[PDB]
Amino acid sequence: VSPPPPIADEPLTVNTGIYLIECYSLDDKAETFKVNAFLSLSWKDRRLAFDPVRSGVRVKTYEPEAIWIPEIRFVNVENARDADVVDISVSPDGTVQYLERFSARVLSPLDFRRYPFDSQTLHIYLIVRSVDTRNIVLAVDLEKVGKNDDVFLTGWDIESFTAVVKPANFALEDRLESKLDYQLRISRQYFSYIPNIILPMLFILFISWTAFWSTSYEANVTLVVSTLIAHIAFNILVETNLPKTPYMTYTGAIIFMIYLFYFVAVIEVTVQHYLKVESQPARAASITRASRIAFPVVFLLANIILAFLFF
Amino acid sequence: VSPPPPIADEPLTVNTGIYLIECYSLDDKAETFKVNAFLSLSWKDRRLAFDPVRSGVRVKTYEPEAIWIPEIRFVNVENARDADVVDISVSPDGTVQYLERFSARVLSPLDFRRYPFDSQTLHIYLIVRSVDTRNIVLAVDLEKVGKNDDVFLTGWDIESFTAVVKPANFALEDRLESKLDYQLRISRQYFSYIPNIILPMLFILFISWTAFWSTSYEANVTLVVSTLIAHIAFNILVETNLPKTPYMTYTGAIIFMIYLFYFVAVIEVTVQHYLKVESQPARAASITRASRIAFPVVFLLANIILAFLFF
Amino acid sequence: VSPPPPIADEPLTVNTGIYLIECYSLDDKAETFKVNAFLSLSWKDRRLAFDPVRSGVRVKTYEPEAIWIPEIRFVNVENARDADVVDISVSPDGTVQYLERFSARVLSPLDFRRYPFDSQTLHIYLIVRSVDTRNIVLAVDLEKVGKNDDVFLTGWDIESFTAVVKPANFALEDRLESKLDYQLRISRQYFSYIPNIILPMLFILFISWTAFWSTSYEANVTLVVSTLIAHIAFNILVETNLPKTPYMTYTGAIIFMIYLFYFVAVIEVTVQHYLKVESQPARAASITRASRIAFPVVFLLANIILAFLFF
Amino acid sequence: VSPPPPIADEPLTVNTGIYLIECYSLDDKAETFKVNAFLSLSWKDRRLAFDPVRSGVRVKTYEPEAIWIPEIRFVNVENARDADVVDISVSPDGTVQYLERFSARVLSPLDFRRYPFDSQTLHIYLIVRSVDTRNIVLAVDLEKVGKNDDVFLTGWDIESFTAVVKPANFALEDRLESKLDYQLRISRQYFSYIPNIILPMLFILFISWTAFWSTSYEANVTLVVSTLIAHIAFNILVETNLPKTPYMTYTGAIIFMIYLFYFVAVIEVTVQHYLKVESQPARAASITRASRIAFPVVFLLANIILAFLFF
Amino acid sequence: VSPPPPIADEPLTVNTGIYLIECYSLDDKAETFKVNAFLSLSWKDRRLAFDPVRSGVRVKTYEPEAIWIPEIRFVNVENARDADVVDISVSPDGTVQYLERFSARVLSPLDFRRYPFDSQTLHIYLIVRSVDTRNIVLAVDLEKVGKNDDVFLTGWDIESFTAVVKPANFALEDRLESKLDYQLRISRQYFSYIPNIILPMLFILFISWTAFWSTSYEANVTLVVSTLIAHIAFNILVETNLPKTPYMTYTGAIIFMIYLFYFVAVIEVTVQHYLKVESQPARAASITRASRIAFPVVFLLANIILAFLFF
Numbered sequence A, B, C, D, E: 001v002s003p004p005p006p007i008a009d010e011p012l013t014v015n016t017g018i019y020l021i022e023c024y025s026l027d028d029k030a031e032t033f034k035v036n037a038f039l040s041l042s043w044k045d046r047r048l049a050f051d052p053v054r055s056g057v058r059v060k061t062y063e064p065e066a067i068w069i070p071e072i073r074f075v076n077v078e079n080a081r082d083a084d085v086v087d088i089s090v091s092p093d094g095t096v097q098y099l100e101r102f103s104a105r106v107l108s109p110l111d112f113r114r115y116p117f118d119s120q121t122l123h124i125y126l127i128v129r130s131v132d133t134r135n136i137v138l139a140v141d142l143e144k145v146g147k148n149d150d151v152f153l154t155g156w157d158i159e160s161f162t163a164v165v166k167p168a169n170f171a172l173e174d175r176l177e178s179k180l181d182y183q184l185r186i187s188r189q190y191f192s193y194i195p196n197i198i199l200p201m202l203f204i205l206f207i208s209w210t211a212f213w214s215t216s217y218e219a220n221v222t223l224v225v226s227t228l229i230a231h232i233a234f235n236i237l238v239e240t241n242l243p244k245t246p247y248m249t250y251t252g253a254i255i256f257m258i259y260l261f262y263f264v265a266v267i268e269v270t271v272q273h274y275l276k277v278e279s280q281p282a283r284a285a286s287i288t289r290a291s292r293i294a295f296p297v298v299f300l301l302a303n304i305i306l307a308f309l310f311f
């Protein structure tokens, strides 16, 4: 057992395919997902030719250790995948059809910029390293790339599973390495974020603005500080579900901005009271009357500007 | 070792059964459960027959590696199942009886629409892929489907464990695949949700409505905002136990609706105060007097409407 | 290797012992615990007998695979136990003494009715399934059931480790199965629940009742609603440590009842205020005067009733 | 392969050492720690002795399965340790030197009485069970007990790693068992508890006592109940990092005591107000004036008593 | 199979390289990180030398078990690494080129002093232990130390991966041990700490200082105590992400200092009110007027001092 030798001096082509049976645990924080799939491998090995006549059988079945099998590995996994050889078929010419079922935890960065209205392309990268007597090179048999209909990934919509057909070939520590990019295209179901986070967060903000219709300092201070706190809670909640990014995310921004609104609300509440104590309620009155319009208007304007920047 | 060949040209029939020994860890968020069970397999292998009278043994026992065993796999598992072969028996006509004990973690989607008053059908899907010299096909021996009496799944009632007797047969990458649907029917015990979540949540809401019997703005603001905060707490608690769905859930909806009630209460409290400061207590008085009835009534109507839409 | 055949036509008796070396991770929520222990098996295999004299040896040693060993399994485990065969001895008349050291995660339901003053019986169930040429049956050699003195199980007191001597024998898929019940009797150390949960929870309740000595609506509302929120916190704390049961638990009931106290307190606070605004302080005064005694008395009466019902 | 037989009728002596390479994950709640270490074993096997002059070689090598090796096991682990045999040397007189590198998770109870100013003695117990043809007995080769200089265990100082030289020998199920006690002496770095928990907790308490310089019931009620809540938070935080003990811990006590202070502060705030409403401000005034001194003094005295009881 | 013997009496040099394919899970609390990489080993074994001419190949392939391979291990890992041998090549003069792909969890202490503006040096320590017939010694082939371009470690910037070329050699239990230090230089992306923790924390503090423009005790008590509570929440949040250190961290220090601010704020609020009740508003007035400037100024001075001490 060692690689099949060249008729001319060509590289050995290994045809690959991945067929997804299960998708689970897309973990936003860790940036990983779990996959369970068929991996198929095919390649010519002429040493394996045989006569159906002189051997009885149209196809031969072999056990893994009886024949050379190319060492395909995944790049972006945590551990070597878990693999069960399902079947090895050789047709008389010596074409080998290899089928395994595997499960793995795959590393794959997400772009959180438009969370929770984002989409992602997950990758599974197949690789192979050339041996000394010859160069091995990968290809996609499109016939054998797919996914079953039930493959659901909680909280995500699956758009498509396809491979980039042309391998990236490169040198790595003095041997040739041939790498393939399988892509799984998903988009986040943002639905639930609406009732669970966004609206509650808006409600509490609007409740704060009722301070603009009140001349009670002690009341206002309570309205504004209390809701501020609830906002902090949502902030903390939302940030425990995301990893820490070196860029602002869309929700992140809305969340941050809204602090500014609480801060300016407190100022207004403070100024209004101060003026009142100093015996000038009319200036106060018209600062408050303004705020009733200004706050919602600037809040709306600022949001449109953000949606534009982000989307 | 390779498949037993056809007398005529029929498929090979593998009879299967699953007998549950343990059920644990129905995890709502992950949408998985753990199972520990007997898997039974039976099929005819004529190469293995013998004389009942001549042999003087009724039956005969082999070690897994000595005979052909069909590769049965689970579709919706995380990893290949953990299996000990318990026993393999071959009788005179060459019928093999195979028995393993296995544990696995099974993926199976839940419908959270009626949570926490919901029911589910868990699935375990057995599958086999045909080989080159013949097609393998699955069937259910009902005699060998079941579950022991103590199988308790915490926080759920077990209704039934049955198999859909007719396999789904289909082609997958150019070979026939035979698949069976075992169903575990369960329903959630909603009991504890009542004292732990629902009632507390109502109590704090009703406490909010005491503001309708109070002319103190500062008091009301404290009543209404305080309880709203406790409501957010229950909301966050509830939503950490569920996964994120693209559809409202029953509890989800009640929770969301109740925000609307707090918001409107705050408005009323604001309006009442405003009119009082503006020297018109009698309009204020009759808005509050209306609210004493309107709030409980519309809360009751809205709930009946919801239970009707959901159930 | 296959089962030793009957002298007459008797079943094969396997004597068993379990000797606990470690107990850890009694997890209330999952209802499981971890064990590490010796498992000892003994049975007669006549094919293995020998003359003491032409051998010059009292005993003989074997490696697992060299002789027939009965397949004992645990019923109520997650996965097949982890086992090291420590030693196998065969004495002249062919009595085999088998000793293994194993660890396993055991499933075992708890009765949370009297938490945290509760006791439990943990079970480890040994089983064996009969083969075709004979019936195997389990027994307990009391000599070899025990636990070492240091076996401590955090937060629990260990009462006793004993086996029910008589197996339950029954049929399961057309073979006889012999099952033994080892029982580990424990009771919860309730001590810490007192200063960590119970008393705090009482202190905040009592603090609430100070509203009965205050004519300040604003003050009272603060007292009552504040402490109610702390109560919710302890409620949430407590319920994250327990699984969800279809029955009320003792702590659960105290917790729930207390909500009723807060609710009625808020009513009283409300009524008192209302009457005062409506210029009748004397009715108010005697409702409050009553409450100072009613609340603590009815609280004490309701608790005695509950302890009675639960204990 | 079976045990080397006695020259006279002596027991076989296995010399042992443990050399720590890594210490991590001292988990207070689980009462476990993880260790990575060399385990060294030495014993005389005469069947293996050879000549140095004629052999030309002065030491001989072996693979594990080629010679008898005593089965040493750890008592207080979760699972059998993970072990790579590093090397096995045999010298001319047939002395074997065995070396393995292992990792394990070790169970070892902690005394939380003085937390977080506490010290602990972790234990790793080695054990061996005698075989039928002779008794095996353990000893410590001090030359081979130690730890590397970088062995750091987060949040703990390492004082010393020594073995108690004399084994405990005892019978267990009719065989002799020899057991050795390796001790790892550590003490907790309490530093960070000071700024993270203790001081904040004192700060909020002191803030509570400002009520004693205030004649505002509403203000006071807010001061006291608010801080009491923050106190509960620190309580809950602290108790999630400890396991539940059947004894008071030092911090636990301070934490519990402090509730008593809040409760009495609330009473005082209540009494003061009551007297004021009832038109007697001078009794009120001198109760408060007393409390300004009493509170801090009794708090200081109570703490000295506790430190004394605990330390 | 055993070590290749010296031409003269030289040590055997093993050349090593590590080439990172993946970095993930830098966990601050556990002080560990996960790595996935090529490890390459090279050394001369003359027994394996061969004539290019007579044998008709310029390279020679072996399976691990067929030749001697030095036992290289990592020092600071949790468990033995997970390794596939990728390839073993022997050239004519008997130079062996070994290549494995491995994954491991590496322990490596972090200096938290400047968190979250900190940088770290992660280490992977390769080691080998000499055998009896000769001394093995490690070196770095710089040709073979590297990392691929996509190696991203979430929330960290990767500066460089280099090896200190000169081994530390030392004796351990009477054998020579040769150890190499591969260093991975990273610095934390502090960006998101700004909007998520730092600014919110400053906002709530500034809100507190509005109390300095308010003569309402009851209001002030609410501002200062509310925000103090929010600060405790940020404190708790921050400290659950960090392990417990025996030194103050930068954030740690800001956070602690800020408590001092709240406490002094409360005192001011208290004194102001006291003086007012005692009929001297003018002292009060000028204490508050001072505080409006003192607080922000001393806050700013104290921060410059801190940055200076820490950076």
Ligand SMILES: CCCCCCCCCCCCO[C@@H]1O[C@@H](CO)[C@H](O[C@@H]2O[C@@H](CO)[C@@H](O)[C@@H](O)[C@H]2O)[C@@H](O)[C@H]1O
Binding pocket: A027, A029, A229, A232, A233, A234, A236, A237, A240, A241, B236, B239, B240, B241, E229, E230, E233
């Ligand atoms: C004034 C102060 C107010 C402070 C309020 C702060 C509220 C704190 C809420 C945090 C709740 C923590 O739990 C929140 O929900 C569940 C469900 O996804 C998750 O719990 C579990 O842990 C992680 C795993 O790393 C998650 O990825 C998640 O899938 C789940 O398995 C958390 O990641 C967190 O998102």
Ligand SMILES: CCCCCCCCCCCCO[C@@H]1O[C@@H](CO)[C@H](O[C@@H]2O[C@@H](CO)[C@@H](O)[C@@H](O)[C@H]2O)[C@@H](O)[C@H]1O
Binding pocket: A230, A233, B229, B232, B233, B236, B237, B240, B241, C029, C236, C239, C240
């Ligand atoms: C003002 C805002 C305040 C709002 C704060 C909301 C408080 C949120 C508290 C979260 C509760 C902690 O944990 C919540 O409860 C239980 C459910 O029975 C689960 O807690 C369990 O703890 C352990 C096991 O004991 C983990 O294995 C965890 O994954 C989960 O099974 C979580 O999945 C989560 O849903």
Ligand SMILES: CCCCCCCCCCCCO[C@@H]1O[C@@H](CO)[C@H](O[C@@H]2O[C@@H](CO)[C@@H](O)[C@@H](O)[C@H]2O)[C@@H](O)[C@H]1O
Binding pocket: B229, B230, B233, C229, C230, C232, C233, C236, C237, C240, C241, D029, D236, D240, D241
């Ligand atoms: C309106 C006010 C709302 C306030 C509500 C506040 C509720 C706060 C929730 C309490 C948080 C405790 O949640 C948890 O309790 C138990 C049981 O799971 C935990 O005990 C352990 O926690 C972690 C590890 O330490 C998990 O592995 C868990 O399975 C358990 O072993 C505590 O460590 C704590 O993390």
Ligand SMILES: CCCCCCCCCCCCO[C@@H]1O[C@@H](CO)[C@H](O[C@@H]2O[C@@H](CO)[C@@H](O)[C@@H](O)[C@H]2O)[C@@H](O)[C@H]1O
Binding pocket: C229, C230, C233, D026, D027, D028, D029, D229, D232, D233, D236, D237, D240, D241, E236, E240
């Ligand atoms: C109105 C009242 C509000 C009260 C609110 C109380 C807030 C309580 C917040 C607690 C947050 C969780 O607290 C922290 O969480 C994690 C951090 O990974 C820990 O979980 C883990 O527990 C064990 C092992 O499982 C330890 O090894 C620990 O270091 C940690 O890794 C907890 O034991 C605790 O350290």
Ligand SMILES: CCCCCCCCCCCCO[C@@H]1O[C@@H](CO)[C@H](O[C@@H]2O[C@@H](CO)[C@@H](O)[C@@H](O)[C@H]2O)[C@@H](O)[C@H]1O
Binding pocket: A226, A229, B222, B225, B226, B229, C225, C226, C229, D222, D226, D229, E222, E225, E226, E229
């Ligand atoms: C994985 C574990 C997750 C951890 C979850 C733990 C989160 C705990 C959240 C803390 C609850 C906040 O508790 C908060 O205390 C103070 C601050 O207002 C309040 O107590 C309050 O006294 C005053 C002064 O504040 C007012 O605001 C008034 O509203 C009253 O309720 C409450 O309004 C409440 O909002």
Ligand SMILES: CCCCCCCCCCCCO[C@@H]1O[C@@H](CO)[C@H](O[C@@H]2O[C@@H](CO)[C@@H](O)[C@@H](O)[C@H]2O)[C@@H](O)[C@H]1O
Binding pocket: A029, A236, A239, A240, D229, D230, D233, E029, E229, E230, E232, E233, E236, E237, E240, E241
């Ligand atoms: C007035 C009192 C207010 C007190 C409020 C205190 C609230 C504290 C809330 C903190 C909740 C825990 O904080 C965050 O939540 C969890 C939930 O998956 C996240 O999940 C995990 O926890 C930590 C620590 O175990 C890491 O292992 C991290 O990599 C992540 O996997 C972390 O980001 C955690 O830091």
